[PDB]
Design a protein around this ligand. Sequence first.
Ligand SMILES: *[C@@H]1O[C@H](CO)[C@@H](O[C@@H]2O[C@H](CO)[C@@H](O)[C@H](O)[C@H]2NC(C)=O)[C@H](O)[C@H]1NC(C)=O
Lengths: 97, 145, 261, 42, 48
Amino acid sequence: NLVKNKCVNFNFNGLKGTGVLTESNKKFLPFQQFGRDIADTTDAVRDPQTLEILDITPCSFGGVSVITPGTNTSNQVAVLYQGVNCTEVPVAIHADQ
Amino acid sequence: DCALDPLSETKCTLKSFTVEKGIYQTSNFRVQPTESIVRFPNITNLCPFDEVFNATRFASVYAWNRKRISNCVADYSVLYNLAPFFTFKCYGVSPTKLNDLCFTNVYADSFVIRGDEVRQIAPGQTGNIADYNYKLPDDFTGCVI
Amino acid sequence: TTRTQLPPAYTNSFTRGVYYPDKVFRSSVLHSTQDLFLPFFSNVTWFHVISGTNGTKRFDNPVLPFNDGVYFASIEKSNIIRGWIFGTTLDSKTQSLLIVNNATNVVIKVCEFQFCNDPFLDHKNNKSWMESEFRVYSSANNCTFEYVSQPFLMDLEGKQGNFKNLREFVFKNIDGYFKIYSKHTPIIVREPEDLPQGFSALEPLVDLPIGINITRFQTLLALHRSYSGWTAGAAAYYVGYLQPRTFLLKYNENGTITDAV
Amino acid sequence: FNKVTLADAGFIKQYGDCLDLICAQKFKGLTVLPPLLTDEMI
Amino acid sequence: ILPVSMTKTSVDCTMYICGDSTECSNLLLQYGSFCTQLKRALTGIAVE
Ligand SMILES: *[C@@H]1O[C@H](CO)[C@@H](O[C@@H]2O[C@H](CO)[C@@H](O)[C@H](O)[C@H]2NC(C)=O)[C@H](O)[C@H]1NC(C)=O
């Protein structure tokens, strides 16, 4: 059970979800297995191989918007990506996006 | 169309061929998963179940040995691969994927068989040695090994 | 012996008997769950096992009904309370439990036994031979489940005196499962009268898949000899029945129950 | 502003610092659009 | 003290109801356009 830095689907204890597994600072008790948050969603998981738990955060998603002057007078448009880091979504993400 | 360019998607969402000045919301974007993290409970054990199956002596038909498989992950595909183990077919469950499916309270028996009564130890008929010593219930569980 | 009966007493349970419902870790959230729980400030019996009549054995081990669960606990000082045998009819014809603490092995067994009228244990180990402690039963017919592991108790005493154990246990059996919760902590004052007011969380320890129908509860004692008859030191244990309730639970940053309502 | 700020929208809309009430609800389709006029223009 | 404005919010039905489920997107597609009214109303509220 291991890969890092990429949001992927898994089958941890039957759970099928996608998120960016990364290092976690939570101090799970020795018996505790799963993690939750206020909204009652999975937040951290127990490592099967090791004793260091990991955090689950879904990777970036969002909606798009199109700004246009009107098709009259040119057809040039601009694209706004709402609430995402520009470095996280450059113009080269079309391979996997 | 509705995938060629942002103007095309704007027209598709507006259901019109003309668009005025403004900002419009058309669709969303989501990062797709790249690979699979394989998944494993990291179980570190193998059942010591071969002691009952292979030992110095075999229990008699009139006195079966009492032994069960509990808290084990004993693979049955290696048994299927083994040449001596020729019976792996299952009447009510999966013949080849019996091990993969989960089960509980598996009991083991040991009985000497001539060879021609294996077809008769099953319910519905009486064998030469299954008439008086060995038996199976009306709907026998497990698989013939 | 020909000991006399003793009318049981009563004590207030205070705000004790809360356990972790699930294995899932949650933090800084106020979760509410519906499960069997010990009501706050409820009567709980305070059975105390001591040397009776300065050397007369006291059979203060009734066949308490199991019902839906128990909150067995103790303020035990030295090792004298052991055994949580269960039985529908308590005979050789009934499947029964027996949770021994033989050395460093729980030796969980599920087999039919015959039970003595007053079974007991020797806290001091028998000389030469292994031990005459197997006097609790003499016949074992059929066997279903066996489980050997580390002892269910990790309490130590050899360190020094002035502090005793506060073992707490919840025995719940439902839908073919058996869960045990335990927690240990030191004590400040030797007050045996009532349970001190402090929050304690009972973590799950062992889960069993057996499907035994349990209706009654029995406890064993550890007495070696007159050190007349069989006598030991002072001890006390409580029994708390479990009933359904609805609770609001507040978690802390570390995921440990601090208080609940 | 100090009295009102016990809760606000978070002031955060870059989403990069989210590793927890708004951004965790962001994974559930609840976003906040920023006002046209900032507080220094108001 | 008088309130002036409130928070502008946007909700994605497809992801909110069926998060990462293509079969759900195909099944929701048979309902027509059940989400344009909500999106239009929310945009109008934000503009207001
Ligand atoms: C659990 O609560 C403690 C509060 O004490 C948090 O901080 C820890 O404090 C103890 C005692 O002072 C230290 O020994 C630890 O090193 C502290 N942990 C640190 C600094 O990370 C602790 O962070 C909390 N843990 C969780 C998971 O919330």
